[PDB]
Design a protein around this ligand. Sequence first.
Ligand SMILES: CCCCCCC/C=C/CCCCCC(=O)OC[C@@H](O)CO
Ligand SMILES: CCCCCCC/C=C\CCCCCC(=O)OC[C@@H](O)CO
Ligand SMILES: CCCCCCC/C=C\CCCCCC(=O)OC[C@@H](O)CO
Ligand SMILES: CCCCCCC/C=C\CCCCCC(=O)OC[C@@H](O)CO
Ligand SMILES: CCCCCCC/C=C\CCCCCC(=O)OC[C@@H](O)CO
Ligand SMILES: CCCCCCC/C=C\CCCCCC(=O)OC[C@@H](O)CO
Ligand SMILES: CCCCCCC/C=C\CCCCCC(=O)OC[C@@H](O)CO
Ligand SMILES: CCCCCCC/C=C\CCCCCC(=O)OC[C@@H](O)CO
Ligand SMILES: CCCCCCC/C=C\CCCCCC(=O)OC[C@@H](O)CO
Ligand SMILES: CCCCCCC/C=C\CCCCCC(=O)OC[C@@H](O)CO
Ligand SMILES: CCCCCCC/C=C\CCCCCC(=O)OC[C@@H](O)CO
Ligand SMILES: CCCCCCC/C=C\CCCCCC(=O)OC[C@@H](O)CO
Ligand SMILES: CCCCCCC/C=C\CCCCCC(=O)OC[C@@H](O)CO
Ligand SMILES: CCCCCCC/C=C\CCCCCC(=O)OC[C@@H](O)CO
Ligand SMILES: CCCCCCC/C=C\CCCCCC(=O)OC[C@@H](O)CO
Ligand SMILES: CCCCCCC/C=C\CCCCCC(=O)OC[C@@H](O)CO
Ligand SMILES: CCCCCCC/C=C\CCCCCC(=O)OC[C@@H](O)CO
Ligand SMILES: CCCCCCC/C=C\CCCCCC(=O)OC[C@@H](O)CO
Ligand SMILES: CCCCCCC/C=C\CCCCCC(=O)OC[C@@H](O)CO
Length: 453
Amino acid sequence: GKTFFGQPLGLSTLFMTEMWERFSYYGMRAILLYYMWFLISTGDLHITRATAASIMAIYASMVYLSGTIGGFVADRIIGARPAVFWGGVLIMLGHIVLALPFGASALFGSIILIIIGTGFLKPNVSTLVGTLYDEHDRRRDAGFSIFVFGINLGAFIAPLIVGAAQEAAGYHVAFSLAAIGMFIGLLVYYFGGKKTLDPHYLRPTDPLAPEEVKPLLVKVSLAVAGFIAIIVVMNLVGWNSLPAYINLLTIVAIAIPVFYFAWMISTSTEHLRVVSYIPLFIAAVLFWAIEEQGSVVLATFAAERVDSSWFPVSWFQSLNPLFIMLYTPFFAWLWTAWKKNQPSSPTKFAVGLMFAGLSFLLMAIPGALYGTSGKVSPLWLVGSWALVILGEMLISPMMSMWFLSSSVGSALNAQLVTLYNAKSEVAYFSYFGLGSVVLGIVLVFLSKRIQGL
Ligand SMILES: CCCCCCC/C=C/CCCCCC(=O)OC[C@@H](O)CO
Ligand SMILES: CCCCCCC/C=C\CCCCCC(=O)OC[C@@H](O)CO
Ligand SMILES: CCCCCCC/C=C\CCCCCC(=O)OC[C@@H](O)CO
Ligand SMILES: CCCCCCC/C=C\CCCCCC(=O)OC[C@@H](O)CO
Ligand SMILES: CCCCCCC/C=C\CCCCCC(=O)OC[C@@H](O)CO
Ligand SMILES: CCCCCCC/C=C\CCCCCC(=O)OC[C@@H](O)CO
Ligand SMILES: CCCCCCC/C=C\CCCCCC(=O)OC[C@@H](O)CO
Ligand SMILES: CCCCCCC/C=C\CCCCCC(=O)OC[C@@H](O)CO
Ligand SMILES: CCCCCCC/C=C\CCCCCC(=O)OC[C@@H](O)CO
Ligand SMILES: CCCCCCC/C=C\CCCCCC(=O)OC[C@@H](O)CO
Ligand SMILES: CCCCCCC/C=C\CCCCCC(=O)OC[C@@H](O)CO
Ligand SMILES: CCCCCCC/C=C\CCCCCC(=O)OC[C@@H](O)CO
Ligand SMILES: CCCCCCC/C=C\CCCCCC(=O)OC[C@@H](O)CO
Ligand SMILES: CCCCCCC/C=C\CCCCCC(=O)OC[C@@H](O)CO
Ligand SMILES: CCCCCCC/C=C\CCCCCC(=O)OC[C@@H](O)CO
Ligand SMILES: CCCCCCC/C=C\CCCCCC(=O)OC[C@@H](O)CO
Ligand SMILES: CCCCCCC/C=C\CCCCCC(=O)OC[C@@H](O)CO
Ligand SMILES: CCCCCCC/C=C\CCCCCC(=O)OC[C@@H](O)CO
Ligand SMILES: CCCCCCC/C=C\CCCCCC(=O)OC[C@@H](O)CO
């Protein structure tokens, strides 16, 4: 019967809903760093380029950290379907803010809107995907992979369309197209959802019991009061610069897993098996750090060290989702072909880290051989994104912990990307790439012990 690639027809609605949100997100991130460079060059934004690179990282870290709670707010308060809609509305307004004839004053407002909007929409669209499949249904893994292709499809075409629009009609026009991209998703999601989506998800599936509202309000109130108390203390002692606030969000993002892990210990049944997660989680952190630097460090390398005089330099951001779109058909073949091998999930996380380390190690070669004073070939970045996406495919298959590793890895980037420049290029690439490889080699021994557990 009628399907969307063998799947329920509701997938096409959610497939396009997320493609257009990812089009709006990754089209914005493809030019946002260059937009901050431009505001710096005109004197409107009084920060260094190292700070702007750190802003891009802590931006992504907060976006994925905000996704760790959107599932809770939907499942318990507002509902999954209203969360996606109003989440996209906030995402749309965030891109409209950057389209207004403002400058650096509109950066923080746009960032807050997209952080909150993505937190509402991003996890709940995937939740609504699994609601098309009953728990017995076996097309789940096939349906989510189709869903991933739509994530990367919009992520691939966004820098091409938005980047070219920036170099032709300017930034404000380019950011408006990102808002239009989200608006297109809202139209298809609203009217398309009303036809094929279960109305049971217009409301929370686990609404708060009467006795649960007060302790939750206390819990939220104490967290906001403490976070505000820290900001007050910082301004009293003089720690009030923008890098100081970035350091605060970095500590907060990293303190969440280490506190959620330190007291997860207290039952020897899985007391050691809880520990087995740690090497897999920390490996996921360092990989997402390497992977998310493509929009920061590799975006900086493309703009300064590559002869890209015949196309917009923001198009290099399409290499990350392009290789995924190419690897997916091969990788679908691979996992069902080598059924007898069955690579253990721990072992995969090193190969993903080794590949990520290889991608940076490769990028240390052009500067060591030709120097950093000139321009190199664009195929260095093509070969670099070819290796890191290779590792992403291996690590590709609660999502909040998944959101958390990306947030911690991106929070780690908020500190490291400030070390990158033309004079530190070779050492930065070589040492962070070498250290990531040797930390993939230590996994072999640690995987064996996790295999035993
Ligand atoms: C999506 C971005 C990927 C771009 C990959 C480009 C692969 C290019 C390979 C050849 C090296 C650059 C050649 C420069 C070039 O031919 O310029 C033409 C001439 O006008 C001199 O600038
Ligand atoms: C005006 C600025 C507001 C910006 C809002 C950004 C809020 C981002 C994150 C808040 C939620 C942090 C709590 C995350 C958490 O503990 O969940 C992790 C847990 O689910 C692991 O599975
Ligand atoms: C209008 C205010 C901004 C939009 C409201 C949503 C702000 C995000 C979070 C508010 C706190 C909700 C509680 C989150 C929470 O308890 O997460 C628990 C965690 O275990 C999730 O699994
Ligand atoms: C700047 C935009 C302001 C908001 C304009 C749109 C508000 C107009 C009507 C409210 C529609 C709320 C729909 C919420 C919802 O859950 O939609 C889910 C979708 O699947 C349709 O059921
Ligand atoms: C419980 C709260 C968890 C912490 C979440 C707070 C995250 C809020 C905002 C993060 C925005 C990152 C910094 C944005 C920024 O620096 O841009 C403004 C700057 O351009 C103005 O000069
Ligand atoms: C459909 C509702 C949400 C979609 C966004 C709607 C608004 C999008 C575009 C309207 C025009 C954008 C403004 C373009 C602009 O002002 O920049 C050009 C000019 O300022 C620089 O020379
Ligand atoms: C300055 C540019 C305009 C700024 C405001 C743009 C807001 C325009 C339209 C609101 C979009 C609402 C979401 C789109 C949608 O599908 O809504 C359908 C629903 O509201 C119909 O009941
Ligand atoms: C940072 C500002 C956040 C503003 C919104 C955060 C709200 C967080 C916790 C309070 C949630 C109370 C919702 C009560 C509710 O809707 O359920 C009531 C009913 O189901 C109980 O019988
Ligand atoms: C629940 C216990 C609360 C005790 C305080 C918790 C937070 C402790 C320190 C937060 C420091 C914020 C980031 C450090 C900082 O501001 O560095 C400033 C430096 O970069 C120059 O301004
Ligand atoms: C008893 C709890 C376990 C033991 C405490 C573990 C430490 C807990 C939180 C610290 C978070 C890591 C520090 C954040 C970080 O590495 O960046 C520091 C930097 O941003 C300051 O400028
Ligand atoms: C198969 C893809 C992986 C290829 C990467 C393997 C190459 C490993 C390391 C190459 C970087 C060497 C760094 C050379 C170096 O730093 O020398 C110092 C001086 O020459 C440059 O400042
Ligand atoms: C899983 C498959 C991985 C296969 C990767 C094989 C790549 C082997 C070597 C690549 C090292 C980088 C190439 C260095 C190089 O050719 O520099 C010279 C270049 O300028 C030629 O003009
Ligand atoms: C199988 C992968 C191909 C081989 C990868 C190993 C490449 C190792 C180093 C990168 C090329 C070395 C660049 C020359 C160099 O670093 O020395 C320069 C320095 O001596 C000048 O003072
Ligand atoms: C699985 C893929 C592994 C990637 C293998 C590593 C290859 C990476 C870069 C090769 C650099 C070749 C650059 C030489 C070239 O063709 O362009 C010449 C240059 O002078 C034009 O600008
Ligand atoms: C069947 C899949 C095998 C893929 C693994 C091989 C990786 C793909 C390309 C590696 C290219 C090696 C670098 C080529 C090179 O050294 O530059 C050649 C250049 O000097 C010719 O002008
Ligand atoms: C199990 C949780 C995993 C935690 C992974 C994060 C590792 C903990 C702390 C990393 C701190 C990185 C500090 C970077 C640094 O100090 O150098 C950069 C600095 O100069 C920026 O101004
Ligand atoms: C020699 C250390 C054990 C080798 C383990 C295998 C690691 C994978 C590839 C070798 C990477 C060599 C990196 C060379 C390097 O880091 O040079 C640093 C350079 O800045 C100082 O000249
Ligand atoms: C075990 C968890 C590891 C997670 C954190 C790994 C990195 C931690 C700290 C790195 C900051 C120290 C910077 C060392 C350094 O000199 O690198 C900069 C150099 O490459 C350019 O000058
Ligand atoms: C400068 C030398 C560069 C090349 C060295 C890289 C390869 C050398 C050693 C890698 C494997 C070390 C032994 C790992 C091992 O088999 O331990 C047992 C482990 O498999 C148990 O799970």
